[PDB]
Amino acid sequence: ALSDLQVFNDWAYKTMSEVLDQQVELFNGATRGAIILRSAGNTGDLSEAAFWA
Amino acid sequence: ALSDLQVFNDWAYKTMSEVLDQQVELFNGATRGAIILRSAGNTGDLSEAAFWA
């Protein structure tokens, strides 16, 4: 019967890497400039800018 | 590592001059002539003008 026969189950590897679910596209145009994301290099652990009060 | 190294951070002198925040551009066309600004003035602490009734 089916018990006597060796039942080989089906299997596969879709190799899909589960990705982020949170919406994180909120930069520049997405926030019309509100979140300005640029690639500017700067030395030190901090950046300052003195301006008249 | 970084502790041995010295950071100088970053600083600038933009000297941006903070200016008035209240909207005061309400003269001539801005108020449809209701509030008008005249560059020319008049002499004397007072400026009377006798017109017929």
Residue A21 backbone dihedrals phi, psi, to 5 degrees: -105, -25
| Alpha-carbon distances of A10 from A7, A13, B11, rounded to whole Å | 10, 11, 64
Sequence-distant contacts of B5-8: CB under 8 A, at least 24 apart: B7/A43, B7/A44, B7/A45, B8/A43, B8/A44
Resolution in Å, one decimal, please.
Answer: 2.9
Which of A40, A50, A42, A45 minimizes the C-alpha distance to B6?
Answer: A45
Query: Which tokens in the block code for residue A11?
Result: 């299997």
Q: Does A53 touch chain B (CB under 8 A)?
A: yes
Structure tokens at B21: 């925040």
Q: Are A43 and B11 an interchain contact pair (Cβ–Cβ within 8 Å)?
A: no
B-chain CB neighbours of A44 within 8 Å are 7-10
> Which of B11, B15, B18 is closest, CB to CB, to A48?
B11
